Amino acid sequence: EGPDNDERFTYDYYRLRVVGLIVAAVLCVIGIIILLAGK
Amino acid sequence: FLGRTGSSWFKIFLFYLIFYGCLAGIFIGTIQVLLLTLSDFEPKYQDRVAPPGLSHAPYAIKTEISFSISNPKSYESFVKSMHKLMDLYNESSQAGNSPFEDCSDTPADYIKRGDLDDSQGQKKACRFSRMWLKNCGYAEGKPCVVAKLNRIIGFYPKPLKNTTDLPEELQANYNQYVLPLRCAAREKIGSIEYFGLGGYAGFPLQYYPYYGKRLQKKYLQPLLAIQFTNLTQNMELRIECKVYGENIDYSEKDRFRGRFEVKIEVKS
Amino acid sequence: LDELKKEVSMDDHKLSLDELHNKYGTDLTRGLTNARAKEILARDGPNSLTPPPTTPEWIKFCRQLFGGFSILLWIGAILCFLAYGIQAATEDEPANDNLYLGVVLSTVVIVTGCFSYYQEAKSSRIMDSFKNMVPQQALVIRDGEKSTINAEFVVAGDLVEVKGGDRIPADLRIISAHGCKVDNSSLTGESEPQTRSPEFSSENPLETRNIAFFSTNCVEGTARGVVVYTGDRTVMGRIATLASGLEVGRTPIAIEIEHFIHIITGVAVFLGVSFFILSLILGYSWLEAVIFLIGIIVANVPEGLLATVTVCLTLTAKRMARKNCLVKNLEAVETLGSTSTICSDKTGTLTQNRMTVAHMWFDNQIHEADTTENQSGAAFDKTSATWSALSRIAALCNRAVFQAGQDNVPILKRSVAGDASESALLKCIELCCGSVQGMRDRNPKIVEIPFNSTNKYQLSIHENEKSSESRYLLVMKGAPERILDRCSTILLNGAEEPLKEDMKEAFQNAYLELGGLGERVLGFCHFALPEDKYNEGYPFDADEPNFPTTDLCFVGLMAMIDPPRAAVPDAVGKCRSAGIKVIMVTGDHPITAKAIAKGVGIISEGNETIEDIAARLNIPIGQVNPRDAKACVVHGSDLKDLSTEVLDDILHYHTEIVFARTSPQQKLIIVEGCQRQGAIVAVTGDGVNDSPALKKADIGVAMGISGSDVSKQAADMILLDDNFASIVTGVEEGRLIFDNLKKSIAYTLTSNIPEITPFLVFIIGNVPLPLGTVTILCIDLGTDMVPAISLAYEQAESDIMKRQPRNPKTDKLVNERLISMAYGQIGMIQALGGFFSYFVILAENGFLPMDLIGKRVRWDDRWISDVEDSFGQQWTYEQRKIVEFTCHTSFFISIVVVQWADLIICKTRRNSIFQQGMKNKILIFGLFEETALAAFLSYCPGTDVALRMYPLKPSWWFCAFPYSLIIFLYDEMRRFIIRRSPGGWVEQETYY
Ligand SMILES: *[C@@H]1O[C@H](CO)[C@@H](O[C@@H]2O[C@H](CO)[C@@H](O)[C@H](O)[C@H]2NC(C)=O)[C@H](O)[C@H]1NC(C)=O
Ligand SMILES: CC(C)CCC[C@@H](C)[C@H]1CC[C@H]2[C@@H]3CC=C4C[C@@H](O)CC[C@]4(C)[C@H]3CC[C@]12C
Ligand SMILES: *[C@@H]1O[C@H](CO)[C@@H](O)[C@H](O)[C@H]1NC(C)=O
Ligand SMILES: [K+]
Ligand SMILES: [K+]
Ligand SMILES: [Mg+2]
Numbered sequence A: 001e002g003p004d005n006d007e008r009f010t011y012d013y014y015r016l017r018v019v020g021l022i023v024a025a026v027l028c029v030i031g032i033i034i035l036l037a038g039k
Numbered sequence B: 001f002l003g004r005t006g007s008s009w010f011k012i013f014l015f016y017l018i019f020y021g022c023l024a025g026i027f028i029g030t031i032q033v034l035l036l037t038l039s040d041f042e043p044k045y046q047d048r049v050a051p052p053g054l055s056h057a058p059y060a061i062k063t064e065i066s067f068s069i070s071n072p073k074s075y076e077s078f079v080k081s082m083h084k085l086m087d088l089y090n091e092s093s094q095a096g097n098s099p100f101e102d103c104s105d106t107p108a109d110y111i112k113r114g115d116l117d118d119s120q121g122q123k124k125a126c127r128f129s130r131m132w133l134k135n136c137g138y139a140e141g142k143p144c145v146v147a148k149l150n151r152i153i154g155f156y157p158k159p160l161k162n163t164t165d166l167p168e169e170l171q172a173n174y175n176q177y178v179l180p181l182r183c184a185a186r187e188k189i190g191s192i193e194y195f196g197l198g199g200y201a202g203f204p205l206q207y208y209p210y211y212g213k214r215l216q217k218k219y220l221q222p223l224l225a226i227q228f229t230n231l232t233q234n235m236e237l238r239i240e241c242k243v244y245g246e247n248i249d250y251s252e253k254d255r256f257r258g259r260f261e262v263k264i265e266v267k268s
Numbered sequence C: 001l002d003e004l005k006k007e008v009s010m011d012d013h014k015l016s017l018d019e020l021h022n023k024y025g026t027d028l029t030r031g032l033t034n035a036r037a038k039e040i041l042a043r044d045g046p047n048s049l050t051p052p053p054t055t056p057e058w059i060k061f062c063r064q065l066f067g068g069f070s071i072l073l074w075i076g077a078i079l080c081f082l083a084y085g086i087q088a089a090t091e092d093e094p095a096n097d098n099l100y101l102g103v104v105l106s107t108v109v110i111v112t113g114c115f116s117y118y119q120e121a122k123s124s125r126i127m128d129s130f131k132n133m134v135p136q137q138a139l140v141i142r143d144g145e146k147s148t149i150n151a152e153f154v155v156a157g158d159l160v161e162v163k164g165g166d167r168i169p170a171d172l173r174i175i176s177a178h179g180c181k182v183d184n185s186s187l188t189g190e191s192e193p194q195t196r197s198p199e200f201s202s203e204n205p206l207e208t209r210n211i212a213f214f215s216t217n218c219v220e221g222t223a224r225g226v227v228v229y230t231g232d233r234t235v236m237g238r239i240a241t242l243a244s245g246l247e248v249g250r251t252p253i254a255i256e257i258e259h260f261i262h263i264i265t266g267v268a269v270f271l272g273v274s275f276f277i278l279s280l281i282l283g284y285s286w287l288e289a290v291i292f293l294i295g296i297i298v299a300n301v302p303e304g305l306l307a308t309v310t311v312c313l314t315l316t317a318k319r320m321a322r323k324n325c326l327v328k329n330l331e332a333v334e335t336l337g338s339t340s341t342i343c344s345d346k347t348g349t350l351t352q353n354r355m356t357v358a359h360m361w362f363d364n365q366i367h368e369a370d371t372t373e374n375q376s377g378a379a380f381d382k383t384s385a386t387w388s389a390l391s392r393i394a395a396l397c398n399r400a401v402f403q404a405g406q407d408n409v410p411i412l413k414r415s416v417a418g419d420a421s422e423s424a425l426l427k428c429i430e431l432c433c434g435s436v437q438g439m440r441d442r443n444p445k446i447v448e449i450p451f452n453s454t455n456k457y458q459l460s461i462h463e464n465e466k467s468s469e470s471r472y473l474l475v476m477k478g479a480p481e482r483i484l485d486r487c488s489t490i491l492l493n494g495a496e497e498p499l500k501e502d503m504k505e506a507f508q509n510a511y512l513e514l515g516g517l518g519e520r521v522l523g524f525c526h527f528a529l530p531e532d533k534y535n536e537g538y539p540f541d542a543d544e545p546n547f548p549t550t551d552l553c554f555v556g557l558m559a560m561i562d563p564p565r566a567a568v569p570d571a572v573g574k575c576r577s578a579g580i581k582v583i584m585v586t587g588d589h590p591i592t593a594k595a596i597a598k599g600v601g602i603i604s605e606g607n608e609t610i611e612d613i614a615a616r617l618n619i620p621i622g623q624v625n626p627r628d629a630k631a632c633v634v635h636g637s638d639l640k641d642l643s644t645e646v647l648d649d650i651l652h653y654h655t656e657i658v659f660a661r662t663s664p665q666q667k668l669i670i671v672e673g674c675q676r677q678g679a680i681v682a683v684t685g686d687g688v689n690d691s692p693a694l695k696k697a698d699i700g701v702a703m704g705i706s707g708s709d710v711s712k713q714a715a716d717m718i719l720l721d722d723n724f725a726s727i728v729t730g731v732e733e734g735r736l737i738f739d740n741l742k743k744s745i746a747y748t749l750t751s752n753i754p755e756i757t758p759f760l761v762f763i764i765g766n767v768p769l770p771l772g773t774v775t776i777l778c779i780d781l782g783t784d785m786v787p788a789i790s791l792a793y794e795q796a797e798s799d800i801m802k803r804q805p806r807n808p809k810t811d812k813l814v815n816e817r818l819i820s821m822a823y824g825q826i827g828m829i830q831a832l833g834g835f836f837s838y839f840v841i842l843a844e845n846g847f848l849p850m851d852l853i854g855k856r857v858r859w860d861d862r863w864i865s866d867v868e869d870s871f872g873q874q875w876t877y878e879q880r881k882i883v884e885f886t887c888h889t890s891f892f893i894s895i896v897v898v899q900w901a902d903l904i905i906c907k908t909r910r911n912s913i914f915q916q917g918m919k920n921k922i923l924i925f926g927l928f929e930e931t932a933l934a935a936f937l938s939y940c941p942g943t944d945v946a947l948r949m950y951p952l953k954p955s956w957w958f959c960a961f962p963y964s965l966i967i968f969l970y971d972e973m974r975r976f977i978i979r980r981s982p983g984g985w986v987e988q989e990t991y992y
């Protein structure tokens, strides 16, 4: 917007962290699954 | 030789020459495409400069400016940087209707020169006289520090509204058009005196938004001179200058995020 | 020091009984005086063995703390505390950087110390096992009276008494004996009881009957003797000292490790000081000059590599534990793969160590029995009525019996009370005719004449199980020729017939052939006594010939031997196909040694000794060109008078070598001889007479079930099931791990470049620091760990058992070809991918690549809280630093992303991934966990403080992707060239 362009200097680092941690966890689980296919 | 024969030494050179040549050519290619995705007028991200920093002229050894009044070369170090900044706000530097403009001698509202486009020439910036900085060689006794708000493209500094309570409760509250700066230390052993545009202790909103170096060269940002004519002597005084606003915030880590950290000591 | 002990012993068995007493101031009848014995005790010292001085574990741990990488990491750790000290004095720095980094680095050294300490293990209790062979007490005659004393109180000169069941307390001169037999397997590896008597019977004291040795035991009878040697001075006490004293030495794998440590340490100190001066010339303060150096150290040293090696070794040892192959020393996991020569004991190693029936001669025909443990062969005969007649004599004319409670275990494995030949016959009949006890119940024995020294035969009279007869049957067995002189008829295919010169000659032929096979041959015959001349109550006199022992019916011959283990012949061939030379080294007699050599394939068909040529051509052995003989059989008595140079010529000039009747020191000498030629040697054995050889071997392998305690103490590896096929597996595993270590090392080293280059450009370019010191440790200690380990699970790219053993002088674990690829090619591509992401982060935040050159001065200036970017914006100190640390984070993640491809390319040295596939599940696990770790390190809240890791935007992850792919393609194209032309260019330059 014009004088109300506050969103330009903002970033949702909170969501990014939530998503990043979700991904890291799921990649960790997936890895266990493939490894445990025989121990 | 060490490893191989001459014939082998050559071949290993012909390889790494072509190899590293290709790699350099590829690296450069990826740099080209990166640049191709970027604007010339505005950076892709601005969230890391977001809350504006407040910086001053006196080059602090460690957020500190200690010196002796009864000594000449005791403060000549801080006068070097003080001069460096103010030397830019000369009237001879601001000549003709291009690229400067005479703006309200009193704090006014924002000025939009269109978009971040080259569809116009150099966006015309507001003039600023160093003569608006009353009282301030500089203060040989009781320094005359000069404040400054860090430039951010498209940033509209918004002052606080007088809805509720305020630190400098309602005094000279130019609510609509001034970004205030109140310095503090309890520990009240000083004498705060502020100088600026229109005589106000703030930044005139008519100097915003900044259009960037590419669209606004020679642009001048507003200054706020602060003088501490403290009646005390020979002690470290931790003075913090704070700016207030809707778009202004602070951090415990970044001690320059919209504020000062000055340790004055007139050890004379 | 031990050169004296490598020699054959000298003795006094030639002296008379009386003469021997003069030498030791002793009485043959009364024995020593209580006072004289105590005097000699203080004189000579105790009858005991003293363990050699060991190196304390303290010094062993700390010796690892100073090996190249640890030295450099120490210099870094101290240089951290140096810069910290210089700070704490000058400008009060409230930070924790140099202090904490110095603590972290010192911990890395200590923990890495534990890994190398675990790898360099030496579990040796040789002397302890020997000490277990000295009895607690001994029986001596002192002042004309016998008393039990502490065996350590035994001295040279006293009169000792031994009987069946006790250990020989010391080396004795036999002066009196009654039916005494002894088990000399300690000195020979052969357990067949040896008679002991006062009479001297051989110039060689290790063969004479009038000497009994410490480390052996009396098996039966009784004997008295004069002590000639005590403690360390006994024959086997010296073997003990020799074995326990032998210097261990460095393994092939250990030597390889130290070698690349020198290389990497070399480049580290080179670039280290090369850029330390390069910085001072550029006008960098010593305050900074050291900080850069610390970074250089951390970049060059692969912090997690030595521990990777250890884990890869451990995991390989775990797989072998699961095939009944125990590894006592982690490094011995690889030595077997580098082995070019095997020196093998015969008895209990190549052989089962059990007299077993091998052939039978009946019906004018040679039949072969199955000698294998698990009986993997086939039948020979069941139909012939002759067989049942021979079978009956083998069961009936036999006094051997199975021990109680064995019905659970297989026939051939069960313990038997009796001599070896009777046990063999027992197990033979029990196997192919069912319960022998049944046959001995159906035919009650009424009278017998046990095998006599003079008779040379054993006879028995039984009540024929037949109801229509119920009469008296006579059976006998003995020396083949003696049995022949007592026969008139031969049971041919059922019916008897006169013994004509024809069948008599066929007997001699059969007899000579079986004997030629190194087999012990016995004759078997029976006689159905006439009914009218022998009533149902007729008494037979065993003392005086009360019955005919002539004109009997010859039934057949039976031959026997201690046979090879089932898997041995095939394992020997497999070792030989892998280009490993196999030598036999045995305490057994030459005829037996040679026969098993041919049986297992040590001596291949057609190959001759000089003696074979001479007999065939009917010419003198001196007339034979010895170069015409590729095979040789050396008796220990001849070995004794040969110099080592002459032993070296034997080793060089023969492909098929048999060392027979060797002493324990002689086995050591043969091993050393092989090593002297530059060969990596394995020893396989099971006896205490293998202990010195096992110790000296680059790798000693002991048998687990049949092995003596001493042998298993001296070994690096134990075959817990006695499965000789495990040697073949071991060499295969050893070769595979050697290749996979290269892959894992290249992988680990490759990521050094993207950690070095940022520090260099930081100096030469004056740009903001692209990657931090902490960030490097997150790679080498964090992300790269599981992937690097996973390479240990790689399958072979080709048939590794088809290639020759590596040349330990030329074929190195880390060579110039590895460095060229890891440092010069792939690592260089990784460095760029790192830098790219660095320039991307900065440029997207406003600092375009052009304006970055020569900005570090203002960038690092803590007092400039207004640096101008390319777009004209102003940054505080902490703001720009957040972007900088975000650059460290994405550079870090770029390494991870480019290591994805590197992990896949390091999978194979030659083959394509499209050929080898992706069947390594540990490797895939590594990829997922590596990426999980990196993501966690970036996105987990608080990690921005502890590790300076900042959250990355999604687009950031993909910066290095095009570089990751170029790596995959590049290496795939390169290896395509290797395969397409075995010539050499790409091969001799980059083939690891
Ligand atoms: C900007 O203004 C300052 C004001 O102090 C100028 O400083 C002058 O320097 C000259 C020569 O050194 C002196 O003679 C004067 O006394 C100074 N003051 C004035 C008001 O003229 C400085 O030169 C100016 N800089 C530029 C680039 O124009
Ligand atoms: C950061 C940049 C400027 C550094 C570049 C370093 C280059 C020149 C280095 C890195 C790895 C190096 C190579 C590594 C391996 C070999 C094989 C050896 O048998 C001869 C030297 C040779 C061929 C080296 C020559 C120089 C080399 C190519
Ligand atoms: C500042 O200077 C003015 C003259 O320009 C003078 O009148 C005044 O006293 C000064 N102020 C202080 C606080 O010293
Ligand atoms: K050994
Ligand atoms: K590394
Ligand atoms: Mg043996």
Ligand SMILES: [Tl+]
Binding pocket: C298, C299, C300, C301, C302, C303, C752, C755, C776, C780
């Ligand atoms: Tl490293």
